[model samples]
Structure formats: C-alpha cells, structure tokens
Target chain A: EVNGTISIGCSSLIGQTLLPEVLSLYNAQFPNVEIQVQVGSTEQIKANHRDYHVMITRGNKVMNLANTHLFNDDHYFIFPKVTKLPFIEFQADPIYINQIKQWYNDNLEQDYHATITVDQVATCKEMLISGVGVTILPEIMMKNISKEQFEFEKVEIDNEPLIRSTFMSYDPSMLQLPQVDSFVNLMASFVEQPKA
Target chain B: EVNGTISIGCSSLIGQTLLPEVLSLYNAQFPNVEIQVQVGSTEQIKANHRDYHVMITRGNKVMNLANTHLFNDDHYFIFPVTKLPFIEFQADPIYINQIKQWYNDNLEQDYHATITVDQVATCKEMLISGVGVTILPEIMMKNISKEQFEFEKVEIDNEPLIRSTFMSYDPSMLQLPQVDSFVNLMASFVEQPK
Candidate 1:
C-alpha cells in the first residue's frame, strides 16, 4: 500500500484503444505502480470513482466538480450519416433533445432529417464514407483514414467553443502520485485549461 | 437534328457507376432525346469534342470551335475522394502539373508540376478516394465517390480548388423511348439557381 498503487475507470471509447497503451507505458516507467482500468460509461465512472485513483473519460460535462483534477482534452465529432442522423445539419446543430413533456421543438430542428443515432463516434465515421451522409469529427478517427476518407469544408461558427475534457480524478488530491501527476501534465498539453 | 440529342465525354469514374445512373434517369424523361456518354480525359475529349454533341468535362480550356457553342454553369463532384491529380490521378499528373505551374510563378520551371487538368467533378471524387487526382474543370470540383469510401473530411484552404464546367453545346441528349425527359431535367435541376 505504501507503493501507492491506483485503479482507474475508463469510458468505453478510451478503453477501446487507449487504456492498454497507458497500462503498457505505465509498466515500463514504474514496475511497482499497480494500475487497473475498468471500462464503462461516464455514469459508471462517477458512481465508482471513489474506489479508483483515476478516471479517464471525455468532455467537460462536469460543471462544478470541486475535487477532481482535469486530465485530457479530446475532440467530439458531428457525423449525421454515421450517427444515423437523417441529415448533416442536425448533427452540427447545437440543439438539445433531452427535453421532457415537450416531444420536439421546431426552432432547433434541421431542414434535412436523420434516422439513426449511434453510441460510438468511430462507427459514425465509418457510415459517413458510405454516403450515409456527412459528419464532423476530430483529427484522431480520421488520422488513419487514407486521403480518400473524406471531402470537407471548414464550417465557421460564432458561438461558444465545444471541447472534451478528460479528467483523472483522485479520491484524495494530496495522495496523488508523482507519476500520476506526470500523466496529468502530459494531458494538460491537449485542449483547454484543466478543471479543479 | 430536331430530335434533341446530347453527348458527354468523361473518364471511367463516371462510366462505371454514377454516369450510368444519371444516364438512366436522363433517358427516362428525355425519351425523344438521344444522349451518349463517351469516356475519356480532358485531352481525349478536347481532341474529339467536334464529333460529340455535349460534354461535361473539367476546366475552361477553350477548344477550337468552328461552329459550336458551349454553355457552362454549376459544377459536379465525386461523393468521397478525388482521383485526378499529379500525385493522385490514376493516369497522368503531367496535365495537372502544367496547370499548377501556370498558376504559380515559382513552380513553372518543373515540368512534373506544370500541367493542366481536364477532368469533371466526378473524376476528382475518384482521386480523393485514392482512385486518382487531377486538376478540376471549373471553380468547383463537385465530387460523389463510390460507395466503398471514407474521408477525414478536412478542407485545406491553401490548396487549389479543382473544379469542372458543365458544357452543353449540342443537344445529343438521348434517343430512348418518349419517357425520359426527367433525366435531363434532373441534370439541369442539380444546379442551385439554374
């Protein structure tokens, strides 16, 4: 216990490719640092965050987390075809659909339509190539796609910036490892400033 | 010929899939019209446009018109990738190189980079799909790539705009049954304002 081993929770997307990479790197750097990664939703991570030393997920959704320290900055995508959205406009539109009582809103709807919604961003990207329709995504998913993956036009917007915040929350801030701190520092170089 | 006919010259990209679909649609409506699609490049088409009736090719290279009239507006595109360029076009980038060199004073010395392209927007789509790359026909290279394709979809501002022009000189539209006017109508309808 004095070695300060830690368990971390990861969202399915991060767990898909990154968790193993992080574990391999951690083993190389600190043989004594026992690390664990549990894959699930953000809600699951939030529920069991206390049992683990860290959580690596996406986006800045937590508004006022006082104890958590921000970790990474990832990008979100808007691909209607991949997302099974009837149209690209709806994917790019910033309207929220979680409204209750009111079934739908006409003000925030798209002229074109989408029929499906996907759980993973990568899957959405695959659909875009099939002419299922257009999408907006980060450079990562498309990085491996050959030059033929897409034809794009940079859309200019004048609203608040949208960014994903990956947090590495610790149960006790003071007990956070120097190695963990190094990992946090590495992610700090990504997007916006880290949260508390 | 009052029978209203049109001919189009293009590369294999359109010859295989999209152009066929377009021809079917055009023939459906312009039943009285006779249409033909000749697959070729900017060089190939330019050399024989005098024999063809109408063409949807790339660039604004004015062919030697003895008694022909050309009308150009709107552009087409390949759905996914472009397959027409010195680095991307499956055939030869020498044509595109010449065009690039003409646009840039610094690149004019290198023949490899000094070529003009004569491909439609559809051909450009092939290039983007890793099929090929070439200089465009007009202000825009409208692309509609094959189904088995994907893209990161990043727009490069500093890059050149490969475009194609829709040229309609003769009306060799198509000589199918009397029920294919919708095809040519659809062709003209894709144009936003026209």
Candidate 2:
C-alpha cells in the first residue's frame, strides 16, 4: 500500500482525466501512496528537473532522462459548444506555435492570423465553451470533454497524421526509493494492462 | 462567398460556445452562409432532423439518416462557487442521476436530494450566493469564474462517465459546400482515435 507521498509533474492534458484514472489504479495496489500532482506547461515541466520522480508529457522527441514509452498523443482543433457552424483561435501551449501554424496553412485556404490567445488548456477550452474562441490541444486534455459536448476538430496535413507521443520519464539511479520504483513499475503496468 | 442559409440542429452544450465558433469560421470562408441553429438535446436534435442540414447531438446514438463520428464526450461536476451543500435543481436528470449514484456507491453514503427548481440559473445563483455546490455539464459553467469552483470528474467502477457526439444528416447535406465543409471539418476531431 502507498505510505509516503510520490510527487509527479504532469502536463495539462493528463490532469484533465487520465491522472484521476491512473491514480485510482495506483491507489488500489498501494492505497497508501499519497500522490501529489503538479500541473504545468511542457516548458515548465522541462525546467523543473529536481521536483518530480516521474513526469508525463506529450511530445515527439526523446528527452534527456531514461524515458519509457507510454502512448501516442494527437493534437486537435477545439472550438466552443456551437449552436451554429462557424469558428475561432487561441493557444496557451508554446509548443503548438509552429506545428499549429503549419496546420493552419495546410488545412485552411485562407491566410491565418491569431485573433485571440490563452495561456492554459482549461482556459482555452472554457473560452471555446463560452463562444469566445477556438484553440489547439492534445487528445488527452480533452478525454474528459467530448466533441458532442463541444467541437474538437482534428487538424492535419497530407496523408501523414499530425500527432505526438506521450511518455513517463525517470532516472534508473533515482529508483532507490521503494516508493519511486513501485510508482514507475505501477505506471507501466497500468497503461499496458488496462481494465477490460 | 458563402450565401445559402444552412439550418443546424445543436445541443445546449455546443450552443453555448461551439456553434458561434463554427459560424464564425464558416462565415469567414463563405461570407454568406445563413445559419439558423435550433438548440436541443439528442432527442430533440433527432426530432427535428429533417429541418437541418447538419445536426450535432451528444447521445442519440442512432438516427434515420447518415451518421458521421465527431468525438466522444464526458460530463464533469462543477462544484459551488464555494461548495455544494447538496443544492438542488430539477429535471437536469442526466447530471442529477449520476451525482446521486456516485454519492451512494463511492462515498458509501446514503444520499438525500434538494428541492427541485425549474431553472439552473437559480442553481447558479444559489452556488454564487454560497447556498450550495451543483454537478452540471462543464459547458453550462464555461462562463462562470474559475476561482469559483473545482472540477470533479464523475466516474463509476473506475470508468469515467463519457458520451459520444456525432453529426446526423440527410444526403442533402452534401449538396451544400458550406455544410459539407462544416461536416468535413468536424471529422478531424475523431479521425486519429479510431
């Protein structure tokens, strides 16, 4: 059972739904693990190295640490709950800049410009919900919300899919703590051996 | 260059934010697609199917005409501006039922409900006034202040509560570029997942 606390740094996407699901699994085995989740931007997650035992993020490239494959994540265009069909834009994720811009040019025929900007996925999603503007996001951030409830239009280029992968990275040497090892192992199993 | 009037069937959740955004995007491209949105639930959206070019619904899983997958959806609990003292609102049954079930099963507590009222606005008012916390669709509370409430994901047996959204339309929808463009655009939301 989980006894001491295990600190985790997660991207905004996971905090939306996946973390809760992941936590419930972890608790069943080690109910004593007091988990602390720190939600942050990818940039923030990268900068804060000392704080977390494990980090979950969505990206295509490999990180400096000992990284383990988790799952692939995709980006989508999220818009407000619409009563009619039209649209809007903003982005809180700094990583989305170039890729999303390329998506804009590739998918949309019209010249694009940023009319609105938001700093967080929840805020960006809320803005869309309020009929304010649209934004880009990873599929995970929206696992709790749906297109039926709102609009999450996928953006892509060519036949090639526009997407990224997610991973939980940690240092093998840091696996000294039983809590840390238990957590890393638990996470891998949790994702791989899902409930039927 | 968009000029034809396209009628759409929408649910209340999307009516709040998405429809306006879709309209904005469609209008910018076509410049003249007159869109009249009729907002309702999945049942209602299905009921008025013939009247719309594209109909978006949360859970009327099947309809008489063509269907296109949009995205899966989930509902969340919106706590009080401060907290929920089991505040009551009536006839938002889908949400109410879920909350009650969770209260009984997960909390391991017998649940008692509040007085049923006609409107959720009064429900919102009650929350803001510190009367109680209410579980509602996230879309309903989109405009509400962030500092006001915490989001609780509603789940059962470790599975999160979720619903699917789709566009149900007649063959006639393909006739209009604005409508087709709108429908085609929506496909991206669900594309990679399947």
Candidate 3:
C-alpha cells in the first residue's frame, strides 16, 4: 500500500469520540490506506509520535495549538438552571467517597452512602441526575443528557472557571506530505470552533 | 457571639484554597466574623471531621463520606492526569524539581517548560491551549485555566482520575449555630447535581 502503514496514535482520554473528522477525512482521500491506531495516554501517543503518520486528540475548548486548531466547543455542563440538595454540607468532607475515611467523623455532618461510582465522566454525570451522590463533570460529557439532569452553576473554586480542552498534536516533519497537509487542513473545519 | 468563631476545616488540598475563600466570603458576608480554618490531607480531614465547623477536602472521582452530600464540584483536579515528567514530577516525586532541566533534553516534542502549576481543574483551559506543561491531571483540574489552556493526552500510572475523591467533612452531631448552619448549606451546594 503506502510505503509502511500510516499508523496513528491516540491518547486514551479522547477514546473514540473524535475519531471521525481526523481519520475519516484522511481515509476518504486515501482509500487504499491501512490504518493502525495505538490507544493509550498522552504519553503513549507522544512516545509514538515519531512512529505515526498523524495523531488525533479531543477536548472541550480550542486553545492555542501553535500548529493545531479546533473542532468545536460543543459541550456544556448539562444541568437545569435551578436545583437544590438534601444536605447542607455538600462541599464539605464526609459527603463524597473518600480514600481515607477521616472525613466520616469530622464536623458533625451525617454520613451519606454513595449509590454509584463512575469511571467515565458521562456515567458519573448520569448517576448524578437521580442518584444519591453527585458528580462534578465537564459540560461536554454531559451533552447527551436532558437539561433536567442538573442545575447549572458556574463550577468555581475560590472563584475560577473549570474547563476541559482537547487538541490534535503531530510531528512537524510530516508537514510536507500532501496527505498530512490535506488532513490537517480538513481538521481546521473543527478547529477554532465546532461546525454550526 | 457563638461557642466558637466562624471557621472551615478542609483537607490540605482544598483547605489551601478554601481558607482564602472562607476569609473573603466570611469577610464580605459577616464582616466581623472570626474565621478559624483547619487544613489537612484527606486523611487528616477525615480524622478530624467531627471537630470542625465545616471541612474542605479534595481527592479522586468517587468519594465515600460517612453521612454527607457533595456540594460544589469545583470540577478540578488536585493531581496530574498523567505521570508525564513535566506535569507532576515535583509533587509526584522527591526529585520533581529536577524536571526543571527538561529544556536541556534535545527532543523536538520537548514540553519541558510552561507557566502554570497548581491543581488540575485550575489549568484545564490552559493545558488545552498547549501553553505550558500542566502540573495537574484530569478534567476537574485541567478545566480551571483560561479557555486557551488545555491538557495534552497525558499518562502516568497515577494519572487516573483521583477516584479517591476530595471533600469537606463535619460531625453529624453538633449544636446548631449560624456557622454550623452555614457549613451545612455550603455542603448542599456541592452535592446538588449540576
């Protein structure tokens, strides 16, 4: 086919969520290409950056990529505009799960058992809707659920914005390749902001 | 004019950030209130949740509280998403500062330096921008920076979500007061799904 396989490396955090635009575009142009992807953490991809023809990454905001650009800002913390809770000590310890149970005995607040434990951001969010516990997730992961899931409050700590951002990074040595250049240009559509 | 002055007890992580909040908020709210805040790690916060008026803490994604609800999901990370050398070598290890020499390495992908170092949720936006290297991990901490900052897909065995969860704690048994009442309310804000 094309010299060696045009393998791509991806970080685990992005998973398969943003694969379409990056690879699909490249594949459309190179129908004969055989794609092999190695999925792992950012370090995994970075370690393999020299090996891959390109790499795909994902995130909420399109920040300064120096070379890379955006795909979209299409996620928000999906919660209702207004809602309340049963306990007054939500932020305090002894409320959420603890690796160390020290919080269980402090401050006089009663113990509340958690109904679920979610590894993915979206699952934690879903459980938050009717479950006993709460999850602090990004607006993007919560994009699927209905608005009634939660009450939107600016997620702040000591007054600051908590945001998630994703980006695609690749080696510059491949910039001259027509396929690489073409793929990067196509990615620009999603860069800066998502398709409207 | 209560049994104890107004205060907040939190784990070392949040307590570091919360005392300042309690100070500013209490000052703005009570004006004349004396705020006493105790700070400790999750273990410390837990060991003494019974004594404090309100607790402040942080940890992994899932937290287990004896009898409490989460209030504010600061949506932040107190640790790094990955153990990559640049993001969290310092706190991750005794020789983390040695990573300062990252620029010395000759690799082109060398992300040996950048401008932010604080919890992950604090830098999410910046990490995205590829500004500098993020010192924290996960969406919670990574989401805290300007929209331009964002985290690179990083990995280190410890980079997994702080599944341990960090939170504040209080004794289920306590005499009622504005301070205690106030803490209880703050806790609700955290647990309230949003």
The number of the candidate with the highest lDDT is: 2
C-alpha lDDT score of every prediction, in listed order: 0.42, 0.61, 0.41
CA shift of A94, model 2, Å: 6.2
Runs with alpha carbons beyond 4 Å of true place in candidate 1: A1-5, A16-21, A61-112, A129-132, A159-161, A173-196, B1-194
Q: Specify the poorest-scoring 10-residue window by lDDT in model 3 chain A.
A: A82-91
List ranges where model 3 is wrong by over 4 Å. A1-4, A57-132, A156-160, A192-196, B1-194
Chain B TM-scores across candidates: 0.45, 0.75, 0.47
lDDT of 1 by residue, A1-196 (tens): 2234556666645553444444444444554444444544566677776765567666434433423444433233333213223322112113322210011222225433333233334334544554444555544455544345545433223333223455555444634576566545444454334583
By TM-score: ranked, best first: 2, 1, 3
For residues B1-194, what per-residue lDDT tens digits would candidate 2 score against the true structure?
A: 64666777766456544555555555556655544555545666677787778887775455467887666655566663221245444433685677688767755446654323223433443454444456665555654667867777777878877666677887766888777777776665346663
Tens digits of lDDT, candidate 3, A84-129: 2211111212222231122222322555432222222322342344
The lDDT ranking, best first, is 2, 1, 3
What docking tier does model 3 reach?
incorrect
- Of the true interface contacts, each candidate retains a share of 0.00, 0.01, 0.00
lDDT of 3 by residue, B31-148 (tens): 3344444443445556666666565554432234334434333122222222222333113332233233332332246443322222232233333433224444232451244553
The estimated TM-scores of all candidates read 0.36, 0.48, 0.35
Give lDDT tens digits, candidate 2, residues A1-196. Answer: 4467677777654554466556545655675555556655666776785788888776643366888878766778775552133333433344656777877767776555554333345445544554444567667656546567676777676755567777787777768877788888877777784453
